[PDB]
Design a protein around this nucleic acid. Structure first.
Lengths: 91, 143, 194
RNA sequence: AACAUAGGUGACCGCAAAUCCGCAAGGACUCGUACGGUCACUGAAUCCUGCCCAGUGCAGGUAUCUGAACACCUCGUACAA
RNA sequence: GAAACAUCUCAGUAUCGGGAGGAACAGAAAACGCAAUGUGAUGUCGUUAGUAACCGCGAGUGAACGCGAUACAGCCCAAAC
């Protein structure tokens, strides 16, 4: 729920060093979708159901929605993602 | 043979009447997916999977061999006499490649060499080809 | 030599050309398919593509329709993509150009065509000229140029029918090496239609 | 006992109409014009035909909200996406 | 066919409309791109190759340059004057 928000140690990425404290971030930002095959492919080949236009895509969504939160190592300040858990709420 | 004998047994092949006909279902391989027991049975041929390997550079405008192993050469000299031509000193090197298709002429080093000791000249040579070369004899190539 | 009748026929809204265009097709309009003409509308282009005063040459206008569509609807079994289905959206591959050239030729059965191209038309139909030749004529079968469009019709026959022309032999082909794949080895037939 | 029917009722339309056929060129209604003719419901006569507009449908209006593409502006790209 | 099915597939197939010849059609580069001090019209045959490429990236689909052959053949206008 409202965790871990913490100082930890593991840093395993492009820029690292000894395990040092990082923090949680819940990074949310950036452009959304239509960066991948899809908008490009419906530029062309649009006649009457090509590709899987008709089918629902990106799977169905469930109650939760994983977690995001990059954990940046305070120090180098550069970090990587870990597995995401489906948290009901993050605070 | 067994196939030759067909008559004499009702139904040929799998014994049954109303036996195997168009089945199990689908055409060719059934859908690579689930079906109502039509086809499945956990697979992993493929896994990854888009048959064949291809590299865009790999093609025209791609690097090409020929490659030679430092085995044929040593086998070639000094142990047995071979191409008398292109022979000088204890030994020498030069084109002994099936194709002089260009962009090529490297010599790999595998097997036991120098042993000739041989000196070779060709396009770039692998590291494990300098050694077991430059060692007894051998050296720079195709500057 | 005939530059600006090329230059002029660019804008078609410039000045003099436009006025002639105001009074032109007024008469052409209210003139039906099949006409005929003493001279070509653009003298540079005729006498470019191939037109000279000489006997055995004839140039005709043609009108067409306007936009392209006009098509029947498919029967049932429409349900599907649909693939070949659709209605007013599809445009036909043949140009309202190629269509002008035949729909001429099938007016004058006797003669063939090196094809000119249109003058512009508005709110509806486009026009087109279209020179034709005549195969069994004299002076036609004289000048080396403007020969061989009549031998006498041994191979070339109903050119533009087959297709061999200008706009056709374009349309279903352009360029040469490169992008001539699934195009003219000779053409669409062979290298199954694209 | 079903359909039709006269009779009752509602709806659209002033004709370059409403309704309908055709890919188009064109066409039926129509040598017609609202006392018309199209689209529907009920089904002679007699006595009558209550209450409901929330949902659905149709129609009218609408400050505000939502509402596509072209053209316009900003960013981005020596251009473009 | 994809063991359903919509894109895909069967297939530009069946069938339809128009038309030529003894063969048609193509054809003398606004080409190729083994990138080169390289090739030199166009068909076709063999190969390149089930390769590149496409595709619910599923099932399926699917070239070309080049090379070895066959046969070789290059020219006429518009305009300038």
């Amino acid at each position: 729920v409202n965790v871990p928000k913490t100082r930890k140690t593991y840093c395993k990425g492009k820029t690292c060093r000894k395990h040092t404290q990082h923090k949680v971030t819940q990074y949310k930002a950036g452009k959304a979708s239509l960066f991948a095959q899809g908008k490009r492919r419906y530029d062309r080949k649009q006649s009457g159901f090509g590709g899987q236009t008709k089918p629902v895509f990106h799977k169905k969504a469930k109650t939760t929605k994983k977690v995001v939160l990059r954990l940046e190592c305070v120090k180098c300040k550069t970090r990587a993602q870990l597995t995401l858990k489906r948290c009901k709420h993050f605070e | 043979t067994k196939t030759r004998k067909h008559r004499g047994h009702v139904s040929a092949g799998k014994g049954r009447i109303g036996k195997h006909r168009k089945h199990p279902g689908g055409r060719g391989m059934a859908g690579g997916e689930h079906h109502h027991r039509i086809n499945m049975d956990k697979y992993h041929p493929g896994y990854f999977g888009k048959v064949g390997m291809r590299y865009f550079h790999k093609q025209q405008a791609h690097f090409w061999k020929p490659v030679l192993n430092l085995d044929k050469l040593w086998t070639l000299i000094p142990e047995d006499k071979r191409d008398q031509y292109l022979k000088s000193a204890s030994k020498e090197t030069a084109p002994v490649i099936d194709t002089l298709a260009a962009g090529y002429g490297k010599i790999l080093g595998k097997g036991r060499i120098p042993n000739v000791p041989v000196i070779v000249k060709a396009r770039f040579v692998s590291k494990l080809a300098e050694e077991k070369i430059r060692a007894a004899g051998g050296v720079v190539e195709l500057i | 030599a005939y530059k600006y009748l090329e230059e002029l026929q660019r804008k078609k809204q410039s000045d003099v050309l436009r006025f002639l265009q105001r009074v032109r097709v007024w008469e052409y309009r209210q003139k039906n398919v099949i006409h005929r003409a003493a001279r070509p509308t653009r003298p540079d282009k005729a006498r470019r593509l191939g037109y000279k005063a000489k006997q055995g040459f004839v140039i005709y206008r043609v009108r067409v329709r306007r936009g392209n569509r006009k098509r029947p609807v498919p029967k049932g079994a429409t349900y599907g993509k649909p693939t070949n289905q659709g209605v007013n959206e599809l445009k036909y591959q043949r140009s309202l150009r190629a269509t002008a050239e035949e729909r001429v030729g099938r007016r004058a059965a006797n003669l063939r065509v090196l094809n000119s191209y249109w003058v512009n038309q508005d709110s509806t139909y486009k026009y087109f000229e279209v020179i034709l030749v005549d195969p069994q004529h004299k002076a036609i079968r004289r000048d080396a140029r403007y020969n061989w469009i009549c031998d006498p019709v041994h191979k070339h026959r109903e050119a533009r029918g087959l297709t061999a022309t200008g706009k056709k032999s374009r349309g279903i082909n352009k360029g040469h090496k490169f992008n001539n794949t699934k195009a003219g080895r000779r053409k669409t037939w062979k290298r199954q239609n694209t």
